[PDB]
Paper text:
The PHD-catalysed hydroxylations of [name]-1α/[name]-2α in higher animals occur in amino- and carboxy-terminal oxygen-dependent degradation domains ([name] and CODD).
We obtained a [name].2OG.CODD structure using the strategy used for the [name].[name].CODD complex, but did not obtain [name].[name] crystals using this procedure, possibly because [name] binds [name] less tightly, as indicated by a lower dissociation rate constant (kd) for CODD compared with NODD29. We then used a ‘disulfide cross-linking' strategy to form stable [name].Mn.[name].[name] complexes, where PHD2QM1 (C201A/[name]/[name]/R398A) or PHD2QM2 (C201A/V314C/[name]/R398A) and NODDDC ([name]/[name]) are cross-linked via appropriately positioned cysteines. Molecular dynamics (MD) simulations predict the [name].Fe. OG.[name] solution structure is very similar to that of the disulfide-linked complex, PHD2QM1.Mn.[name].NODDDC (or [name].[name]). Comparison of the ODD complex structures and those without substrate reveals clear differences in [name]/CODD binding, especially in β2/β3 loop and C-terminal regions.
Author numbering:
A (entry chain A): 189 to 403
B (entry chain C): 395 to 413
The structure:
């Protein structure tokens, strides 16, 4: 059950550690269909360079070297991505009142992202630096039989205040949650194979409105 | 500061959820 999973596993893990990993989130068949839709999107050549909040160079691959496309989930041939988004939204909304002080009332479009090997990555960064309203980062990974010792691409999270870190392999059908603010600096270490993932950011109501009056 | 030089763009759209 999605609700039971959320309250029994995700809420405690988030409030204690600020990171939560759920493996085998949708199962092999559905995850495979999502991988097919993502690869078909990639095959159309539509992906564009990942963007930064404050971008200073047209080409910023040394900061983040991924290529992305934004998906609403209602698009043609994207039905299963839409199912993934509906599942995540159902889960998150069922966490409301239990993710600290956050009351989630919105999300971004889904960011489908591809690091095309060749040592591309994402230097250590924070998703939400300045209170832009993003409170929870959700990432769904699509890469089968991923061997970090050969392909790199580990997501290393450096939880604030301690020498600790969490290494997250971008493993197929893995769903990852973490606080988007400065508590969780993280980096994608250089990848040497094609690396696919889908990210959704969820917004806190009050921080979102405050960010609205501030921008 | 330099934090937003490294942060991922959120897109131009927010989709309402939950309530
Ligand atoms: O893809 C990953 O594992 C991590 N991605 C990011 O930190 C990002 O795109 O902002
Ligand atoms: Mn990030």
């Amino acid at each position: 059950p999605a609700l039971k999973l959320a309250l029994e596993y995700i809420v405690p893990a988030m409030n204690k550690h600020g990171i939560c990993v759920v493996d085998d989130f949708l199962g092999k068949e559905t995850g495979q269909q999502i991988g097919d839709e993502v690869r078909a999107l990639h095959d159309t050549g539509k992906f564009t360079d990942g963007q930064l909040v404050s971008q200073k160079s047209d080409s910023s691959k040394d900061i983040r070297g991924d290529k992305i496309t934004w998906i609403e989930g209602k698009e043609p041939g994207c039905e299963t991505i839409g199912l993934l988004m509906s599942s995540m939204d159902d889960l998150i909304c069922h966490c409301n009142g239990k993710l600290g002080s956050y009351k989630i009332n919105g999300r971004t479009k889904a960011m489908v992202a591809c690091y095309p090997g060749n040592g591309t990555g994402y230097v250590r960064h924070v998703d939400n630096c300045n209170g832009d309203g993003r409170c929870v980062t959700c990432i769904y990974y699509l890469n089968k039989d991923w061997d970090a010792k050969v392909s790199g691409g580990i997501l290393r999270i450096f939880p604030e205040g301690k020498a600790q870190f969490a290494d997250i392999e971008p493993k197929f059908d893995r769903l990852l949650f973490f606080w988007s603010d400065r508590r969780n600096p993280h980096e994608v270490q250089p990848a040497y194979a094609t690396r696919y993932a889908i990210t959704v950011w969820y917004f806190d109501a009050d921080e979102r409105a405050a960010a609205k009056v501030k921008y | 500061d330099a934090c937003t030089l490294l942060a991922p763009a959120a897109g131009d759209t927010i989709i309402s959820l939950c309530f």
